[PDB]
Structure formats: C-alpha cells, structure tokens
Amino acid sequence: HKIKGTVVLMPKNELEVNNLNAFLGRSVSLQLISATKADAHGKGKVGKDTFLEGINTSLPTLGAGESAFNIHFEWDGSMGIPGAFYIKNYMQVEFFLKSLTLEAISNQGTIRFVCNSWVYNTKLYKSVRIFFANHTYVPSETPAPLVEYREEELKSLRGNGTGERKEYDRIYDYDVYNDLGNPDKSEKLARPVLGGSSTFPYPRRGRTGRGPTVTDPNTEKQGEVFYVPRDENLGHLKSKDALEIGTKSLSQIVQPAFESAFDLKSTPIEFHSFQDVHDLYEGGIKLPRDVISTIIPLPVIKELYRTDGQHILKFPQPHVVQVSQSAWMTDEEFAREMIAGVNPCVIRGLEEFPPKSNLDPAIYGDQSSKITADSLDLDGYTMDEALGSRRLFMLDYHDIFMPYVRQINQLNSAKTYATRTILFLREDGTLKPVAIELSLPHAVSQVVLPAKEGVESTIWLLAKAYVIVNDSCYHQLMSHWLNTHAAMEPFVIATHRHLSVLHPIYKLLTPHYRNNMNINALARQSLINANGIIETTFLPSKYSVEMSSAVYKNWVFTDQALPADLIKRGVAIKDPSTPHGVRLLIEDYPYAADGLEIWAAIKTWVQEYVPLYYARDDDVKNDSELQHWWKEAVEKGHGDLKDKPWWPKLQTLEDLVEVCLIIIWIASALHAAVNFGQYPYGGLIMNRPTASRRLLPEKGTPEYEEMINNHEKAYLRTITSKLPTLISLSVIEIASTHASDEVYLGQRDNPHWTSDSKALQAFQKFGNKLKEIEEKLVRRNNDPSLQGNRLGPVQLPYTLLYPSSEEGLTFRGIPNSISI
Ligand SMILES: [Fe+2]
C-alpha cells in the first residue's frame, strides 16, 4: 500500500541575491489529502505525517539549483485517490517547493503537483500549507471532498484587512497610494493621497499595513521593506537577474555617491557640447575612486557600466546612434518616433481645424489654437483636402499640461510649455511635422514653424525638445506607469483573493502577472516616492504622480483593447473587409500594424481556451469565484471608477473573452512596446529629454545671442542637467534589460500546469503562431517599401514586438508580464 513520490525543492541560498542531509530525518512532513473519500464532515481524509526519506540524485530532468527527494506514503484502500497535500517545514530556514509527483496511482498512472511556493517553518503559519494536484476545476466541478479546502485556502489568502504584513504572509488586499510621501521626515515630502476620492482617483495597490505616520494619519509610515505576498517576491538563480532591486540600490547608494562627486566639483556640473554627451559611451566619464568603489561590487548595478575599476565609467552605446550620430536631429525621425518610438500610442488624427481645448475658458481663457491653416506647408494640399483625405494628425498635450504648468514653472529648475504638434501624412507614407504651438497660462501662445537655416532653425530644434519633454513625462507616468504597472496590480490582487489555484481562469491569467507586484512595491519605495528617482529627474518633480491621477480620470478599461484604442485616437477606422476589422489611416504605422498581429494571436488563444471550461453564457454567470473576482476587481481594485457604465458585466462567454484578452494584452505586448525601447531611443538624452529648465530666450538677451552662436549649448542649457541625466540613463538601462529567467509570450515555466491535454494543445498552437508572426515581422523590416517608418534615418529596424528574445538589452521580446 505504498505510493512512491518525488519532491523537488530549492534550498533558500540558491535563490538569494548575495547540507541537503538536514532535510531528511523528521525535518519535512507531507500528508496526502483524499479527493474521493471524505470524513464525517465531508472533508477529504488526511493521511499520516510522512517524511523525506533520501536524496534522488538519478533524476535526469532536474534544473539548476533543484534537488529531488524520495518519499513513500502508506495509503491503504480506505483512503481513495490523493488530490492535495499538506506540508509542514520543521526546519528553521524556509525553502522553495517546486513539485510533488506520485507514481503508479489513479487511472492516469501519475499525479502531478506544481507548487512553486515558499514554505517557512510551520510555526509561522496560522493554517497548514496546502497544495492541489494539477487538475483544473471550475467551482461547481470541484470534487466534493475538496470543496471546503478550496474555500478555506482562498479565505486564508484574503485575510481580514488588519495588521502589519510580514515577509512570510501570503495575504492579498488593497490600499490606496498613501505610502509615497514622508511627512514625518519633513513637511516638504508630504504628498497627496492618491485614490479614494474624486479629486485624485487612482487604482489600488497591495496593502502593507505599516500603520500611520504621526504628522498625518492619512499617510502610511516608511519601512525598510515594502511587503508583497511572499510568492510574488521572486528569487533568481543569478543575482544579475534581480533587476527589480536595482532601482533601490540606485536611489539609496549610487545616487548619493554621484551627488557627492558633483558637489566635490571634481567633474564639471554641466554638459557644454554634444560631444560631452557622446563621451559617456565612447571614452566614458572620469569619477573619483571613492565613487567607482561604490558601484563595481553592487549586483545588478555592476552590469550597467563598463569600468576600469578605478576612475572610468562608460555607458553602452544607444541603438539610436549606432549608424548616424545626428539622425535624431531630423524632423523625419522626430515624427517617426511618434509611431515607432518608445511612446508610439498617443498621436491622434485631426478631423477639424484648428484644434480646440476642452478646458474651462472661465478659468483658463480662450485656449483655442493660434495655428493658422494658411501658414502650413502641406506639400501643395489645402487644409480642406488634407482634412478630408485623413492626412492631418496631432500630438496634443495642451489639455494635459496646461492645468499644471503654473505649478511646475514655479519650481526652481523647471520651466515648461504645454505643446501641440501638427503632423501631415505625406504621399510617401511618412509623417512631416508642420507646426508646434508652445503655450503658457494667462493664454500666451507662440507658434514655431520648421526651419533649416538661421536663428529660426534653433528655435525649431528647441521647440521639438519642449514637445519631447511633454512626451517623455507622459510616456513615463501615463503610457508606462499608469496604464501598465498601476492599472494591472488590482487585477493581480483580485485574482489571488477570489480565483482558486484550481480555477481555469487563474491558470490562464497568472503567468501574465509575474513579478508585477514586486516591481510595483519597489517602485513605490524608490521610484515614484517623494524625492525618489522620478521626482528628482523628470520635469514635474513633486507633481509627477498626481498628474497621472488626473489622467486616470479619463481611463476606460475597454479602450485599452488595441482596435478600440486605434479607433478612439482616429488613426484607424472600422472595416469588416480587413483581416483585423480595422483599417489603419497611417498604413505602415509600425507599432499598430505589428501589434494587431500579436493581438489577434492572443485573441485566438483566449477564444480557444475559454470554451474548454465554459460551454454557454449561463456557465459564466453561475461561476461564483469568477463573479466575485470581477465584482471586487471593479468595485475595490478600480473602485474610484466603479460607477462608470463601460465596465463589462461578465454575463456571457463573449465578455469573459474580452476581459481576459485585454488584461493579457496590457501585461505583455503593450507594456513591452512602451518599455523595452527606453534606453535604445532615450539613452541619448538629447533625443528624449526628461526635463526642461528654461523657456525660450527673448530677443536682445545674452541667452538669445548664445542661441545664435552656440546652439549646442543653448540646447543643453534647456534640457536635463548632467547629474540627473546620469541617474535617468541608469534607470532606463535597467528597465530595458531582459533578465535571463524571463518567461516570454508563448512560454510557461512548467509543462504540467494543467492535466487537460486540450488546453496544452491549444497553448502549443498559440506558441506556434507567435513563431509564424515573428517571421512575418522580420519580412516587414526587410521590405524596402517600409523603410521610411520601420527604420527611418536612424536605420533602427522596429523589433519591439518580436515575440522572442535572449537576455540583455535587445530591443525585442515580449514578456508574459509586467516584470520590470
Ligand atoms: Fe515597466
């Protein structure tokens, strides 16, 4: 009556960022739980404590850091078929359980458990850790002897909403963004609570429970570690893959070290020519020994720079200068990066002229554009013909920036304009910028037109920089932080609270959450906190995160679907005669054209997976875990917007498909497209400035004369200063790196995630289509008719939506999740 089992675990030291015999004896007990035989109270019968017997060295399938143990369970004919197990760790040190495999049992001959969980000493847990077999069950199909265990494990994951969360807790719950300020250190570091009001609505984040500050009971006190539920806090076999901790080290160690060197006046405070900037990746920058000594031993940080270990630090050469050092300065590239750059999804089509503002004129005055139709060079078209043939588009930030420019322009080292850019689609299918409008409140507007000669060519170059400062802010805080990182976290929380590990939709979605809560927590601690990396390098300083709350007011879940976005922005129209059901108005638009192929692939996968478990609309309605999950994700997780009419109701098969498709799209391809191009395009600070420090010089001043004689200096005085540049380059270099243990779209981290062979086959064909799509995109980049937008004058093929990637700074590869 003995069942042979194999346990696979990883000792803690393998996964730490920096013998086996101790696991034998009576150090680790497992008890099997019956799926088919119940006790008096209807719960599956539990077997006896069984201990690890010996090491299994002759297991061929083991990966790095993994060890296997033999175990034998006495299990007689009264016990039935195992469907779960308890495990108790009596050691003092936690370990990472991977799997349990039982042999020669059940009609399938083998029962597989995939656990991937941290198991601490049984004393630290209020209830015993339980793990289920790899079957998939909607709630009403749960074997009756497991139903109660399923419900109790979910209760355990929800907690009660009280207490300070400890490292070993696995408790998922919501709180507002009240942990970014630090008013107990200084009132200067006070920040508004984001979330829970109509003024400052925001997605919720993971609750940590550290308790209130003394100066403000609405704000959470600081802590050395921002808690995440334990199995969200990913360990890695290689310390260099722990990218998420780099922002912490950059903020706490590296940044102070850089600041010291500059205050020392050992390095010049400012760039004085463009060559000073290019030197950063050619010969490097000389810094004091003390400062280099702080970098070279730090894991993760030590990979960002070449160094001789004493005085020289050198950044990698950014892709956007790999061929032409100057091409970024062309109007062609400026426009091309709005459809193929780091932030390719804000441009809008223009259907009337001039553009209008929606801001209240009683407060802001007339905000109607001062651009005149007759002033534009539209390659011979008239305005009427350009409008009617859908060849006018705008990159418009006026209404986003104008209600904040007064507050920003009062900061010491910040000056900005609210901008509008007009773009004309030429006959060759490339976009041409034809006007920039620079606005100030109280409104004052200057229109700048393209010029290649004279003083007006410098005013135009600077005007482009003010536009890109707007765009960089919007990219970092809205396109990137708000729309991917922050919008996704509530869905992660709700999924673990309300869908069992056994649930088919849990298995569909959870790979697309990998590392998301982890990076978000570390970001709240060191990236978007008061005086953190964003606040000290990007234009809006202390207003940065609140701006993203102002924009979240206009966030609509169903408008995150790629076809809906394209139609909403007026760059595509509905067309059922086309493959994707939408016709692009910029035909070669590289982000959208490739993205539609990825979107369609995900859609087929979701459409082939969901019907395996839901045959009719009523099955969706009658899934209580699914209904509670969606109710809480809307009413709590995105609860400041719970009264909007556009939320799906989750009453049909079609709704469930669309809800899961949008979530997967956001976590994978959308985040990839806006994230992994940051250093390739923005590693040159002149191409993607993060801040502007002055307004345009007035005629008759020294600054204006400087413009005439020394345009490179005029440009550098206006954009990001040298010291914040070094910090921002470092953080976007981290963000643009693929860890070697990344899981890419089309892959999973274990081949036994379900026992359902039909789901496995559907997942196999998904991965097969992704390979077909990659070949198609490779062909697009080699098509000479598409070079103008897919490569441009920088000659940088658009690879950001290729599915697969090796490790490193590759400018390709779509991860499953928001993992950095
Ligand atoms: Fe990211």
Q: Are 163 and 144 in contact (CB under 8 A)?
A: no
Catalytic annotation, pick one of 480, 496, 498, 580: 480
Give the 3-state DSSP-derived string for 21-37, with helices as H, strands as E and coil as C: HHHCCCCEEEEEEEEEE
C-alpha 321 – ligand 1 centre gap (Å):
23
CB atoms closer than 10 angstroms to residue 604: 14
Q: Which residues contact 127 (CB under 8 A, 6 or more apart)?
A: 152, 156
- Amino acid type, 219: T
Q: DSSP state, 70?
A: E
Q: Reduce the DSSP state of residue 40 to 3 states and report it.
A: coil
Rounded CA separation 421/437 (Å): 7
Look up 485 and say whether it is catalytic.
yes
* Spatial CA neighbour of 764 closest among 575, 650, 609: 609
Rounded CA separation 742/752 (Å): 18
Q: Which domains does the chain have, with CATH numbers?
A: 4-155 (2.60.60.20), 156-255 (4.10.375.10), 256-344 (4.10.372.10), 345-471 (3.10.450.60), 472-818 (1.20.245.10)
What is the distance of C-alpha 505 from the center of its chain?
21
Q: Are 220 and 213 in contact (CB under 8 A)?
A: yes
CB atoms closer than 10 angstroms to residue 36: 16
Q: Are 555 and 561 in contact (CB under 8 A)?
A: no
**Token code pair at residue 680:** 């390739």
Look up 236 and say whether it is catalytic.
no
* Spatial CA neighbour of 811 closest among 666, 685, 680: 680
Q: Are 29 and 49 in contact (CB under 8 A)?
A: yes
β partners of residue 584:
572
Look up 285 and say whether it is catalytic.
no
**Token code pair at residue 16:** 């730490």
* Spatial CA neighbour of 676 closest among 734, 608, 618, 754: 734
Catalytic annotation, pick one of 89, 343, 520, 675: 675
Q: Are 108 and 755 in contact (CB under 8 A)?
A: yes
Q: Are 612 and 759 in contact (CB under 8 A)?
A: yes
Q: How was this structure determined?
A: X-ray
CB atoms closer than 10 angstroms to residue 108: 10
C-alpha 479 – ligand 1 centre gap (Å):
10
Angle between helices 590-609 and 653-665 (to 10 degrees): 140
Q: Classify burial at 91, counting beta carbons within 10 Å of its beta carbon; exposed 0-12, middle 13-18, buried 19 or more.
A: middle
Rounded CA separation 563/573 (Å): 9
CB atoms closer than 10 angstroms to residue 689: 26
What distances in angstroms separate CA 684 from CA 276, 278, 360, one per listed residue? 11, 8, 38
Rounded CA separation 147/141 (Å): 9
Rounded CA separation 423/428 (Å): 14
What distances in angstroms separate CA 434 from CA 234, 378, 421, one per listed residue? 48, 8, 8
Extended strands (E) in 370-524 = 392-396, 418-425, 431-440, 444-448
Q: Which residues contact 784 (CB under 8 A, 6 or more apart)?
A: none
CB atoms closer than 10 angstroms to residue 430: 18
C-alpha 698 – ligand 1 centre gap (Å):
40
**Token code pair at residue 812:** 């390709």
Resolution (A): 1.9
- Amino acid type, 77: G
Q: Are 693 and 743 in contact (CB under 8 A)?
A: no
Binding site as annotated, residues for Fe cation? 480, 485, 671, 675, 820
The Cβ-side half-sphere exposure at 281, using a 13 Å CA radius, reads: 21
C-alpha 667 – ligand 1 centre gap (Å):
10
CB atoms closer than 10 angstroms to residue 380: 7
Catalytic annotation, pick one of 496, 498, 512, 671: 671
Look up 671 and say whether it is catalytic.
yes
Provide the H-helix boundaries in 623-699: 624-632, 653-665, 671-675, 678-682
* Tally of residues, the chain: 820
C-alpha 476 – ligand 1 centre gap (Å):
9
Catalytic annotation, pick one of 135, 236, 485, 496: 485
Look up 738 and say whether it is catalytic.
no
Q: Are 217 and 209 in contact (CB under 8 A)?
A: no
Query: What's the chain's Rg over C-alpha atoms?
Result: 28
Rounded CA separation 707/728 (Å): 26
What is the distance of C-alpha 383 from the center of its chain?
40
